[PDB]
C-alpha cells in the first residue's frame, strides 16, 4: 500500500547529435590508376568496366547524401518567420533562433556547433575531388529556422497541415496534458517553468562550448572520410612488386614489352585500392543513411509533434524539441518534464462508501495518514474524493485492499442546503 508521487518537477533539456550526410567524393578512375599515361590507359581498358562501376557507386553515394539532407531538413512546405516581438510567455528562445546581426543568420548555438566541428583542396587532388552539398549551410539554417518558427508559433498543428497560431503558454499547457499533467500545473507555475527552461538552454550552450567531445559523432564522420582519402592517395606510392612506384619512370626507363608488365602490376594494385575505397564508402553510406533516416523520423515525431515513445526524444516525458544545424548533421534539443521531489503516501485501489466500490476516473487515491484524497499520478495535487472524480462498479468485497472512506456527493449535499426543512 505505498505509492510515491512527485511534488515538484524539473524541465530538462538534453542534446542528441546525429550524422545526416558524408563528404561527397568523386574519383577519376583513369587518372588515379594511370595518371595521364596513354600506355597505362590502353592496358586499363583490358580490365573491363570496373571504372564505370566505381563511378556509379560513388555517384549513387553522392546522390544519397543529398537525399539524406533533404529528407532530414526539408520537411516543411513553407518558410515560417517569427514575429517581430519575440515574447513567448517568458520563454527566451534567443539561443536557438537566427541572430540577425551575424552573417549566415545562424543561432548562437548553431554558430558554436559550426565552430567546433572542422572549395579546392590541394591535398589529395590527384583525381580525387569533393563535390559541394546541394543545400548550402545557409539553406539548412533556413530550414531549421522555419521549423523553429513553426513549432514556436503554431505548435503541433504545423506538422499536420496549415500552421495555426496558438499562444505559447497554451501550447505548453496542451503538451502538459499530453504527458498526463493538468493544464493548471503549467499555469500556476508558468514563471517557474519559463525560468527552468531558460536555465536549461543556457546550460546547453555552456555544455557544448566547454566539452571537446560533445560533437564527436560528426567529427568521427569527417575523420573517417578524410582518413579513407589519405589512405587511397597514400597507396599511389606503393610499388606492388613493380620496379618503381612512378609510372613515368617505368615508361622512361623500359621498352613497351617490359613496361606493360610493370604497369600491369601497378594497375592491379591501384585498381584493388579503388575497389577497397569504394566498398568502404558504400558501407559507410549505408550507416549514414540509417542515421539520416533516424534523424528524419525524430524530426517528424519530436519536432513536428509530441512523442509518447519512451527515450525516443530524450530522457523523461517528452514535451517538445528544437532542431539545430551542424556540419554534416543535425543536433536536437529535447525538452522534457522530469518528476522531482517525490513523497511516499499510503494508497488503496478503491474507496468503499455505501457498500459500493469507487475507482478513480483519472488518478490515484492517496492518504497522508489521516485523510484520503484523489491526486493526479504525475503531480501531487490532493482533491476531495467525490462522485464526480470516481466511478462505481461492484460491491465492497471482490476488490483486494479496499479501504473505508467517505465519498462525497455534491448533489445530495446540495439537496440538503436547499429545502431539507421545506419551510
Amino acid at each position: 500500500n505505498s505509492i510515491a508521487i512527485p511534488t515538484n518537477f524539473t524541465i530538462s533539456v538534453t542534446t542528441e547529435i546525429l550524422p545526416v550526410s558524408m563528404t561527397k567524393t568523386s574519383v577519376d578512375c583513369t587518372m588515379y590508376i594511370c595518371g595521364d599515361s596513354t600506355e597505362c590507359s590502353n592496358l586499363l581498358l583490358q580490365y573491363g568496366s570496373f571504372c564505370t562501376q566505381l563511378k556509379r557507386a560513388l555517384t549513387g553515394i553522392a546522390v544519397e547524401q543529398d537525399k539524406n539532407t533533404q529528407e532530414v531538413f526539408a520537411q516543411v512546405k513553407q518558410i515560417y518567420k517569427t514575429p517581430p516581438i519575440k515574447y513567448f510567455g517568458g520563454f527566451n528562445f534567443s539561443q536557438i533562433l537566427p541572430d540577425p546581426s551575424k552573417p549566415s543568420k545562424r543561432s548562437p548555438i548553431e554558430d558554436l556547433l559550426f565552430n567546433k566541428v572542422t572549395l579546392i583542396c590541394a591535398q589529395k587532388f590527384n583525381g580525387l575531388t569533393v563535390l559541394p552539398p546541394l543545400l548550402t549551410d545557409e539553406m539548412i539554417a533556413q530550414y531549421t529556422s522555419a521549423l523553429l518558427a513553426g513549432t514556436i508559433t503554431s505548435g503541433w498543428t504545423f506538422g499536420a497541415g496549415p500552421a495555426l497560431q496558438i499562444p505559447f503558454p497554451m501550447q505548453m499547457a496542451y503538451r502538459f496534458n499530453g504527458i498526463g499533467v493538468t493544464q493548471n500545473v503549467l499555469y500556476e507555475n508558468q514563471k517557474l517553468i519559463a525560468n527552468q527552461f531558460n536555465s536549461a538552454i543556457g546550460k546547453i550552450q555552456d555544455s557544448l562550448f566547454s566539452t571537446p567531445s560533445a560533437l564527436g559523432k560528426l567529427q568521427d564522420v569527417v575523420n573517417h572520410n578524410a582518413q579513407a582519402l589519405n589512405t587511397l592517395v597514400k597507396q599511389l606510392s606503393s610499388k606492388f612488386g613493380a620496379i618503381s612506384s612512378v609510372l613515368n619512370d617505368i615508361l622512361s626507363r623500359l621498352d613497351p614489352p617490359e613496361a606493360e608488365v610493370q604497369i600491369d602490376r601497378l594497375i592491379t594494385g591501384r585498381l584493388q585500392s579503388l575497389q577497397t575505397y569504394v566498398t568502404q564508402q558504400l558501407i559507410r553510406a549505408a550507416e549514414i543513411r540509417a542515421s539520416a533516416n533516424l534523424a528524419a523520423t525524430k524530426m517528424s515525431e519530436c519536432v513536428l509533434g509530441q512523442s509518447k515513445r519512451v527515450d525516443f526524444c530524450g530522457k523523461g516525458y517528452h514535451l517538445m524539441s528544437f532542431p539545430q544545424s551542424a556540419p554534416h548533421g543535425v543536433v536536437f534539443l529535447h525538452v522534457t518534464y522530469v518528476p522531482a521531489q517525490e513523497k511516499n503516501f499510503t494508497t488503496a485501489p478503491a474507496i468503499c462508501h455505501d457498500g459500493k466500490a469507487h475507482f478513480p476516473r483519472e488518478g490515484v487515491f492517496v492518504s497522508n495518514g489521516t485523510h484520503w484524497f484523489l491526486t493526479q499520478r504525475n503531480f501531487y495535487e490532493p482533491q476531495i474524493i467525490t462522485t464526480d472524480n470516481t466511478f462505481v462498479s461492484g460491491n465492497c468485497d471482490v476488490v483486494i485492499g479496499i479501504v473505508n472512506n467517505t465519498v462525497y456527493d455534491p448533489l445530495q449535499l446540495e439537496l440538503d442546503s436547499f429545502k431539507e426543512e421545506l419551510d
Binding site: 512546405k77 518567420k81 514575429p83 515574447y87 572549395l119 563535390l131 546541394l134 545557409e138
Partner: protein, 89 residues
C-alpha cells in the same frame, strides 16, 4: 556544361589557348558563363528569380529549361513560400 572544381578564368584561358582535352566548345558567349561553388557553368543564363529546384547543379544552384523561346537558366533554388504566422498573446 559544368566544369567542376575550376575557376571560369582558367577555363576561358584554356579555351583561348586550345589547351582543353575535350575538343568540343560551348559557344560561351556573354551572360552564359556563371561561377558557382561547384565549378564553372557554361551554357546557362543566371537569373535572380528563384524557382523550385529541377536539375541540381550544387551549392544552392539549380538549372532548368524555361521560357523567358526557351533556354537553360541557372538560379538559386527557392526553399518554399514565405508564411508569417500571426502570433499573438
Amino acid at each position: 556544361v559544368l566544369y567542376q572544381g575550376v575557376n571560369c578564368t582558367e577555363v576561358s584561358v584554356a579555351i583561348h589557348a586550345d589547351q582543353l582535352t575535350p575538343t568540343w566548345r560551348v559557344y560561351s558567349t556573354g551572360s552564359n558563363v556563371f561561377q558557382t561553388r561547384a565549378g564553372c557553368l557554361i551554357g546557362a543564363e543566371y537569373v535572380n528569380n528563384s524557382y523550385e529546384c529541377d536539375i541540381p547543379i550544387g551549392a544552392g544552384i539549380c538549372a532548368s529549361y524555361q521560357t523567358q523561346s526557351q533556354s537553360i537558366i541557372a538560379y538559386t533554388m527557392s526553399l518554399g513560400a514565405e508564411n508569417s504566422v500571426a502570433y499573438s498573446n
